[PDB]
Amino acid sequence: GVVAAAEKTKQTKEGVLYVGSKTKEGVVHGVATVAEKTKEQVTNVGGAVVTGVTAVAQKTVEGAGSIAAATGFVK
Amino acid sequence: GVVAAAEKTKQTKEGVLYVGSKTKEGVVHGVATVAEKTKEQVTNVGGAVVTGVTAVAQKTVEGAGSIAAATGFVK
Amino acid sequence: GVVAAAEKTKQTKEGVLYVGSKTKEGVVHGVATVAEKTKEQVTNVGGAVVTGVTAVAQKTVEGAGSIAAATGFVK
Amino acid sequence: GVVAAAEKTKQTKEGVLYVGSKTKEGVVHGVATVAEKTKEQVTNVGGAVVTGVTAVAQKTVEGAGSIAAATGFVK
Amino acid sequence: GVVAAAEKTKQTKEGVLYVGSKTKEGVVHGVATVAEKTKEQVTNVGGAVVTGVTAVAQKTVEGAGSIAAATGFVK
Amino acid sequence: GVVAAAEKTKQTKEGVLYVGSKTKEGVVHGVATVAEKTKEQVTNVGGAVVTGVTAVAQKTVEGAGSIAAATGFVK
Amino acid sequence: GVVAAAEKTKQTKEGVLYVGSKTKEGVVHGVATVAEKTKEQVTNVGGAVVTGVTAVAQKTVEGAGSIAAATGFVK
Amino acid sequence: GVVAAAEKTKQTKEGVLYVGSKTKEGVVHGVATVAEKTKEQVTNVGGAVVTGVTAVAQKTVEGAGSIAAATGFVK
Amino acid sequence: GVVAAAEKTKQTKEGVLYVGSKTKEGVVHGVATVAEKTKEQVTNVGGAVVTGVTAVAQKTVEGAGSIAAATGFVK
Amino acid sequence: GVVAAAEKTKQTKEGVLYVGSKTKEGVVHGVATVAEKTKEQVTNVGGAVVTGVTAVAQKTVEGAGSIAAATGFVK
């Protein structure tokens, strides 16, 4: 029973963004899952993932955001 | 029973962002899961992940945000 | 029963951000889970993770934010 | 019964941030979980994690924020 | 019964931040959990974790913030 | 018989130099002799060697300059 | 017979130099001789070696300059 | 017979120098001789070696300058 | 027969120098001879070696300067 | 026969120097000879060695300067 329910019932500068970036070398890998000689691996990533030399996450969840995750195994 | 419920019922400068970044070398890896010769690994990541040389997370959860996570196994 | 419920019922400079960053070398790894020759590993990360040479987390949870996590195993 | 409930029912400079950072070398690792030859490891991280050479966490939880975590195993 | 409930029912310079940082070398590790040859480890981290060469945590919990954590095992 | 003989017998702006250089990154190696797994190497450098991002060699040999070089081997 | 003989027999702006340099990063190695796993190496450097981000060699040899060099081996 | 003989027999702005240097980072190695696992190395450096981010060599040899060098071996 | 003979027989602004240097970080190594696991190394350095972030060598050899060098071995 | 003979027989601004240096960090090593696990090393340095963040060598050899060097071994 992995249920994620989100409801949004709705009846000057807002959220204005300025970014200036100057990079010479950049290595960004984000979400990564590496397995070497591994017998068993389970990985789950949910939600907002902002990454990089200049990472800005503004006003990410204004309304309703549900992240339900059942990660794992059964023997 | 992994349930995540979010409800948002709704009946000058706000949230204004300024970022200036100057980088020469940058290595950003974000969310990573590395397993080497590992027999068993379970990993869960939920929510907002902001990463990098200049990471800014402004006004992340304005409304309703639910992160329900059942991470693990059963033998 | 891993339940996360968030409800937000709603009937000059606010939240204004200024960031200036200057970096020469930067290594940012964020959320990481490393296992080497490990027989068993369970890892859970939830919520807001802001990381990096200049990490700013402003006004993260304005409304309702629920993080419910049941991490572990059963034998 | 790992329940996290958050409710927010709502019927000059506020929250204004200024950051100036100057770094030459920076190594930031954030949330990390390392296991080497480990037979069993369970790790849980919840909430807001702000990290880095210049880490600022302003007005993190304005409303309702619940972090419920049941971390561990059963034999 | 690990329950965390937070309720916020609501019917000049406030919260204004200024940070100036100048670093040459910086190593920040944040939340870390290291296990080497360990048979059993359980770790839980909850709440707000601000770390780094210049760490500022201003007005962290304005409203309601609940951190309920049951960490441990049963044999 | 490696003989170098130089004789100088002597019985408004002259030689005036102006240099303005502006560099951001510069790698200058000059005279270099690299041998890797080499069984035999003979190297000779003679005279004036001017090198670099802004290299100026003005009025190098006003008088007598002799460079005699016998480079090599005998088996 | 490696003989170097120099004789100088002697019976408004002259030689005036102006240098303005502005560098951010500079790596200068000059005269270098590198041998790795090398069985035999012979290196000779003679004369004037001017090197670097802003290298100026003005009026180097006004009089008599002799560079005699016998570089090498005999088996 | 490695003989170096120099004789100087002698019976407004002259040689005036102006240098202005501004560097942030500088690595200067000059005359270097590196041997790694090398069985045999012979190196000779003679004369004037001017090196660095701002290297100026003005009026180096006004009179008599002799550099005689016999570099090498015999088996 | 390694003979170096120098004879000087002698019967407005001259040689005036101005240097202005501004450095933040500087690594200068000058004359260096490094041997690692090397069985045999012979190194000779003679003359004038000027090195560094701002290296100026003005009017180095006004009179007689002899550099005689016999570098090497015999088996 | 390593003979160095120097003879000087002698029967407005001259040689005036101005240096202004401003350094934050400086590592100067000058003349160095490093041997690691080396079976045999012979090193000779002769003459004038000027080194450092601001190195100035003005009017080095006005008269007679002889540098005779026989560097090496015999088996």
Q: What is the DSSP string of chain F?
A: -EEEEEEEEE--EES-EEEEEEEEEEEE--SEEEEES-S--EEEE-SEEEESTEEEEES-BSSEEEEEEEE--B-
Q: What are the beta bridge partners of residue F18?
A: G18
Q: What is the DSSP string of E4-50?
A: EEEEEEE--EES-EEEEEEEEEEEE--SEEEEES-S--EEEE-SEEE
Q: CA of C17: which chain D residue's CA is closest?
A: D17
Chain C hits for D15, Cβ within 8 Å: 14-16, 58-59
Chain C hits for A68, Cβ within 8 Å: 4
Selecting from J51, J66, J68 the residue whose C-beta is nearest the C-beta of H30 gives J51
The residue among B61, C50, C65, D17 whose CA lies nearest residue E49 is C50
* Cβ–Cβ below 8 Å for A72 and C42: yes
Query: Distance between CA atoms of J42 and A38, rounded to whole angstroms?
Result: 53
* Cβ–Cβ below 8 Å for E6 and D6: yes
The residue among A48, E54, C56, D52 whose CA lies nearest residue B19 is C56
Sheet holding A42-45, edge to edge: A42-45, B42-45, C42-45, D42-45, E42-45
Task: Say if CB C63 and CB A63 are below 8 A apart.
Answer: no
Indicate the pairing of strand E48-51 with strand C32-36: unpaired
Task: Say if CB H66 and CB F46 are below 8 A apart.
Answer: no
DSSP code, position B53: T
Sheet holding I13-14, edge to edge: F13-14, G13-14, H13-14, I13-14, J13-14
Q: CA of H69: which chain I residue's CA is closest?
A: I69
The residue among B54, B62, B53 whose CA lies nearest residue B15 is B62
Chain J hits for H44, Cβ within 8 Å: 71
Task: Say if CB C62 and CB B14 are below 8 A apart.
Answer: no
Q: Return the exposure string of D2-22: e unless at least 16 CB atoms fall within 10 Å of the residue's CB, then b.
A: bbbbbbbbeeeebbbbbbbbb
- The tokens for A34 are 């590496």
At residue A24, the 3 state secondary structure works out as strand
Q: Record the resolution, in angstroms.
A: 3.0
* Cβ–Cβ below 8 Å for C51 and E30: yes
The residue among A12, H22, E69, J60 whose CA lies nearest residue I20 is H22
Q: What Rg, from alpha-carbon coordinates, does chain A have?
A: 19
Query: Distance between CA atoms of H6 and I64, rounded to whole angstroms?
Result: 5
HSE-up of A28 (CA within 13 Å, CB side)?
Answer: 17
Q: Which chains touch A (3 or more CB pairs under 8 A)?
A: B, C
For residue J20, give the amino acid letter: G
- Maximal C-alpha separation, chain I: 58
For residue D3, CA distances in Å to A67, B3, B20 come to 14, 10, 41
* Cβ–Cβ below 8 Å for D73 and C68: no
**Is F29 labelled a binding residue?**
yes
- Maximal C-alpha separation, chain D: 58
Chain F nearest CA to H53, separation (Å) = 9
Chain J nearest CA to H32, separation (Å) = 9
Q: CA of J30: which chain I residue's CA is closest?
A: I30
Chain H hits for G55, Cβ within 8 Å: 50, 55-56
For residue G36, give the amino acid letter: E
Query: Distance between CA atoms of G50 and G66, rounded to whole angstroms?
Result: 18
For residue A63, CA distances in Å to B6, B66, C2, D15, G52 come to 9, 11, 22, 21, 60
Task: Say if CB E22 and CB D22 are below 8 A apart.
Answer: yes
* Cβ–Cβ below 8 Å for G15 and F15: yes
Query: Distance between CA atoms of D11 and B11, rounded to whole angstroms?
Result: 9
Query: Distance between CA atoms of G44 and I71, rounded to whole angstroms?
Result: 9
For residue D22, CA distances in Å to A4, B23, B51, D55, D57 come to 42, 10, 18, 13, 18
CB atoms within 10 A of CB A13: 12
Q: What are the beta bridge partners of residue J26?
A: I26
Task: Say if CB C42 and CB B48 are below 8 A apart.
Answer: no
Query: Distance between CA atoms of F48 and F58, rounded to whole angstroms?
Result: 11
* Cβ–Cβ below 8 Å for H2 and I2: yes
Chain C nearest CA to D41, separation (Å) = 5
DSSP code, position I72: -
Selecting from D26, D31, D62 the residue whose C-beta is nearest the C-beta of E26 gives D26
Q: CA of I28: which chain G residue's CA is closest?
A: G28
Q: What are the beta bridge partners of residue B72?
A: none
Q: What Rg, from alpha-carbon coordinates, does chain F have?
A: 19
Selecting from C4, C30, C44 the residue whose C-beta is nearest the C-beta of A51 gives C30
Query: Distance between CA atoms of J69 and A47, rounded to whole angstroms?
Result: 73
The structure tokens 């639910």 sit at: B66
Q: What Rg, from alpha-carbon coordinates, does chain I have?
A: 19
Query: Distance between CA atoms of E47 and E67, rounded to whole angstroms?
Result: 6
Dihedral of CA atoms D11, D12, D15, D21 in degrees, nearest 10, equals 170
Q: CA of D49: which chain E residue's CA is closest?
A: E49
The structure tokens 């602004």 sit at: I13
CB atoms within 10 A of CB F13: 10
Task: Say if CB D67 and CB D47 are below 8 A apart.
Answer: yes
At residue B52, the 3 state secondary structure works out as coil
Chain B hits for D6, Cβ within 8 Å: 64
Selecting from F30, F42, F44 the residue whose C-beta is nearest the C-beta of H51 gives F30
Task: Say if CB H40 and CB I39 are below 8 A apart.
Answer: yes
Query: Distance between CA atoms of C12 and E13, rounded to whole angstroms?
Result: 10
Query: Distance between CA atoms of B68 and D68, rounded to whole angstroms?
Result: 9
Q: Which chains touch C (3 or more CB pairs under 8 A)?
A: A, B, D, E
Q: CA of H61: which chain G residue's CA is closest?
A: G61
The CA angle I49-I52-I56, to the nearest 5 degrees, is 65
Q: CA of D44: which chain C residue's CA is closest?
A: C44
Selecting from H55, H64, H66 the residue whose C-beta is nearest the C-beta of F52 gives H55
Q: CA of I42: which chain H residue's CA is closest?
A: H42
Sheet holding D32-36, edge to edge: A32-36, B32-36, C32-36, D32-36, E32-36
Task: Say if CB I44 and CB I33 are below 8 A apart.
Answer: no
* Cβ–Cβ below 8 Å for H53 and I50: no
Selecting from C13, C19, C49 the residue whose C-beta is nearest the C-beta of D49 gives C49
Chain I hits for J62, Cβ within 8 Å: 62-63
Phi then psi for residue A40, to 5 deg, are -150, 130
Task: Say if CB I35 and CB J35 are below 8 A apart.
Answer: yes
Chain C nearest CA to B31, separation (Å) = 5
Selecting from D44, D50, D65 the residue whose C-beta is nearest the C-beta of E50 gives D50
Residues 6+ apart with CB under 8 A from C28: B26, B27, B28, B29, B51, B52, B53, B55, C51, C52, C53, D26, D28, D30, D52
Task: Say if CB A3 and CB A69 are below 8 A apart.
Answer: no
3-state SS of chain J? CEEEEEEEEECCEECCEEEEEEEEEEEECCCEEEEECCCCCEEEECCEEEECCEEEEECCECCEEEEEEEECCEC
- The tokens for A67 are 């992240």
Residues 6+ apart with CB under 8 A from B62: A59, A61, A62, A63, C62, C63
The residue among C72, D37, C45 whose CA lies nearest residue B39 is D37
Query: Distance between CA atoms of B64 and J68, rounded to whole angstroms?
Result: 85
For residue F46, CA distances in Å to F29, G71, H45, H46, I50 come to 17, 11, 10, 9, 18
Task: Say if CB A66 and CB A7 are below 8 A apart.
Answer: no
For residue H6, give the amino acid letter: A
Query: Distance between CA atoms of A4 and C71, rounded to whole angstroms?
Result: 18
Query: Distance between CA atoms of I71 and J70, rounded to whole angstroms?
Result: 6
CB atoms within 10 A of CB B49: 31
For residue F69, CA distances in Å to F47, H69, I41 come to 10, 9, 23
At residue D41, the 3 state secondary structure works out as coil
Annotated binding site of E for Cu cation: 29
* Cβ–Cβ below 8 Å for E12 and D17: no
N- to C-terminal Cα distance for chain E?
19
Number of Cβ pairs < 8 A linking chain B and chain D: 9
HSE-up of A52 (CA within 13 Å, CB side)?
Answer: 10
Chain F nearest CA to G47, separation (Å) = 5
Residues 6+ apart with CB under 8 A from B9: A7, A8, A9, A10, C7, C8, C9, C10
Q: Which chains touch G (3 or more CB pairs under 8 A)?
A: F, H, I
- The tokens for C26 are 């930067």
Selecting from J1, J27, J41 the residue whose C-beta is nearest the C-beta of I1 gives J1
The structure tokens 């040389």 sit at: B53
